Design a protein around this ligand. Sequence first.
Ligand SMILES: O=P(O)(O)OC[C@H]1O[C@@H](O)[C@H](O)[C@@H](O)[C@@H]1O
Ligand SMILES: [Mg+2]
Ligand code: NA
Length: 219
Amino acid sequence: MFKAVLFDLDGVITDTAEYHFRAWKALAEEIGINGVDRQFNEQLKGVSKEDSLQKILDLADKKVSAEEFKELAKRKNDNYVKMIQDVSPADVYPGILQLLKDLRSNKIKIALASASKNGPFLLERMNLTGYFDAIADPAEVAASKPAPDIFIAAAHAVGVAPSESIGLEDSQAGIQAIKDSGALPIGVGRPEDLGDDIVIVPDTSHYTLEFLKEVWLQK
Ligand SMILES: O=P(O)(O)OC[C@H]1O[C@@H](O)[C@H](O)[C@@H](O)[C@@H]1O
Ligand SMILES: [Mg+2]
Ligand code: NA
């Protein structure tokens, strides 16, 4: 049986992937880049703030100064941080609170493997911090998603091997990171976005301890 679950935050715990998308699209349009639509945004999910901005600039083969790059990233963050102030426990996705409770009752470790530096603040907004045994700090990894480092760190932070862990993700980059960590991925979203080669559930209500067991027994 698995000994840890490694949670992505945005698009897994709550609908903040939507807010990252809206904030990045707004930023892109301010600088005359109009290609950040929902399809393109699948390439941005799970990706760090700086890598996200660079992918957007690349889309237009646009170059900005180092000073402008810093300011643009800060502008997007300031906007996103204002968007999330009213997040509350009511915004926790279906099934997630119960899963956290059931994992703890079964002595299964819980770790956060979010790329977001705003992750701790969001867990506090949602009254979830006390469920987490560890938060892997994305500022401390040498390499960001789709590199596996954040998932490896999360597992190690709770004293469990990645190979004894499940990772929950909504993103292409994050699914790849889980795969390369050695943990077992279960995605949430559309196979057209996340692939047909791992277990994918259509919504977070499917993330029951019963189902994670159903999946683990068959890997
Ligand atoms: O700018 P932050 O809060 O550090 O977030 C970094 C990344 O966090 C990830 O969780 C999101 O999927 C990305 O969309 C986001 O860019
Ligand atoms: Mg995500
Ligand atoms: Na406009």
